[PDB]
Amino acid sequence: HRSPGVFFDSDKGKTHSSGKVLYNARIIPYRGSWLDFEFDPKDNLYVRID
DNA sequence: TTATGTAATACGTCTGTAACTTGTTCTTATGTCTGTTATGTAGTTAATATAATTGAAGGATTTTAAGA
């Protein structure tokens, strides 16, 4: 499985019309809720909870 | 020649078998009534107590309605 902790990933420029590689961070515990922090194509940082 | 008397032979026939049928008589299987016990239903309890719940997770593409 995936080790608990924080993983920093990117979409490799395959989502938006332009390249615009978008970066996100995901924290996963052994037990509990997930947290996500993404970048949008407008260069603003957003949060997702579960 | 012809009466006579035996003998073959064909037909009734008296009786022994068997089929058709009923009486009735006894036995048994079944349907029903009744009494008793277990099952199924229902109502009530009065320190006080006053916004769940449990997960779940590397998807990748299309098409089509709402929002602006």
**Interatomic CA–C1' length for residue A14 and nucleotide B60, angstroms:** 12
CA A29 from centroid of its chain's CA atoms: 15
Cβ atoms of residues A28 and A37 within 8 Å: no
Q: Per the structure block, which two tokens stand in for A26?
A: 């995901």
Cβ atoms of residues A37 and A24 within 8 Å: yes
* A33 CB less than 7 Å from any atom of strand B: yes
Which residues is A45 bridged to in the sheet?
A39
Resolution in A: 2.7
* A7 CB less than 7 Å from any atom of strand B: no
Quote the CA–CA distance of A3 and A43 in Å, as a whole number: 29
Which residues is A49 bridged to in the sheet?
A35
Nucleotides on strand B lying under 7 Å from protein C-beta: 55-58, 61
Quote the CA–CA distance of A32 and A24 in Å, as a whole number: 20
Name the nucleotide with the smallest C1'–CA separation from A1.
B58
Q: Which residues are CB-neighbours of A20 under 8 A, at least 6 positions away? A: A13, A41
Per this entry, what is the length of chain A?
50
| Burial profile A10-40: b = 16 or more Cβ within 10 angstroms, e = fewer | eeeeeeeeeeeebebebebeeeeeeeeebbe
DSSP annotation of A45: E
Cβ atoms of residues A15 and A40 within 8 Å: no
